[PDB]
Amino acid sequence: MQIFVKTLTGKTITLEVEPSDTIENVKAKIQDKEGIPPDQQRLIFAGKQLEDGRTLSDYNIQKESTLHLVLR
Amino acid sequence: MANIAVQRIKREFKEVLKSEETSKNQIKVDLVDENFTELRGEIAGPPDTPYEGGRYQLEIKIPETYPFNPPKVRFITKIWHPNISSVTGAICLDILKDQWAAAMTLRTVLLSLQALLAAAEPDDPQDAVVANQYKQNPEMFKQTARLWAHVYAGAPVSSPEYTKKIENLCAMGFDRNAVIVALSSKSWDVETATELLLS
Numbered sequence: 001m002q003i004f005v006k007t008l009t010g011k012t013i014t015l016e017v018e019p020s021d022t023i024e025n026v027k028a029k030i031q032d033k034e035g036i037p038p039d040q041q042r043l044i045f046a047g048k049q050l051e052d053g054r055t056l057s058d059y060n061i062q063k064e065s066t067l068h069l070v071l072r
Numbered sequence: 073m074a075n076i077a078v079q080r081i082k083r084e085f086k087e088v089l090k091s092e093e094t095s096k097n098q099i100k101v102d103l104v105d106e107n108f109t110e111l112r113g114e115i116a117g118p119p120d121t122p123y124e125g126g127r128y129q130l131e132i133k134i135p136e137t138y139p140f141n142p143p144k145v146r147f148i149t150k151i152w153h154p155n156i157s158s159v160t161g162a163i164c165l166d167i168l169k170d171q172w173a174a175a176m177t178l179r180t181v182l183l184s185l186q187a188l189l190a191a192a193e194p195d196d197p198q199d200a201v202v203a204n205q206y207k208q209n210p211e212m213f214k215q216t217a218r219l220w221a222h223v224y225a226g227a228p229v230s231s232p233e234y235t236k237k238i239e240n241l242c243a244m245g246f247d248r249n250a251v252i253v254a255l256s257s258k259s260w261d262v263e264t265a266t267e268l269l270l271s
Binding site: 006008042044045049068070 | 246262269270
């Protein structure tokens with residue numbers, strides 16, 4: 001499925017992900033798509049910073065949803 | 073019922089209503105509880121100040137050792153000012169603490185606070201964040217208060233620029249109030265305030 005990651009510079013990308021995917025590999029995928037090291041990304045959804053441990057469905061984030069990226 | 077002088081609050085209550093300030097629409101007062109230990113005050117932002125246009129509410133409670141120990145006052149309406157907690161309404165004024173006096177009238181207190189709006193007392197702050205911004209950027213402070221006055225005090229025009237930055241963060245799903253305190257506390261830096269927001 002696809003979701004959208006939006007940064008605070010305005011940029012907005014759409015990347016392939018799996019509901020089962022954890023937060024780290026989403027970052028991993030963000031890395032692979034834009035070159036940003038997961039080592040420096042923070043994903044926000046509905047005023048909360050998704051913890052590396054939970055997944056997308058674990059958090060109940062249905063497809064097409066938007067996540068926010070805040071670089072360390 | 074340990075409230076000593078319920079017969080003074082009553083006199084000082086008349087006093088305020090019958091004052092020229094109230095007809096001049098600068099200050100006004102209202103009762104909240106029967107016994108007369110908690111009033112609700114309201115003052116107008118003084119002209120020529122970012123508070124202009126705003127109408128601010130104050131929580132006035134009277135403690136047991138009243139005359140002698142001053143009455144505890146808080147700002148109900150959210151205000152951004154060196155001498156008022158930007159997130160609790162706690163005030164910091166000499167007379168509302170130790171430099172308080174025997175016969176200080178409520179009217180003397182309401183006017184005092186109004187005057188305070190016209191000229192803060194940064195060196196004896198209550199809110200470190202506000203006092204700092206008010207010194208290292210008296211312009212930003214003013215622009216920031218002009219906003220707070222608008223979103224919370226029913227004042228007119230506000231910075232269309234700041235509304236833009238409050239939008240980008242609210243997008244991530246943050247609470248409005250929170251968003252504002254972060255942006256105001258971090259010098260309106262979308263990056264450095266989103267930071268604070270996560271702690």
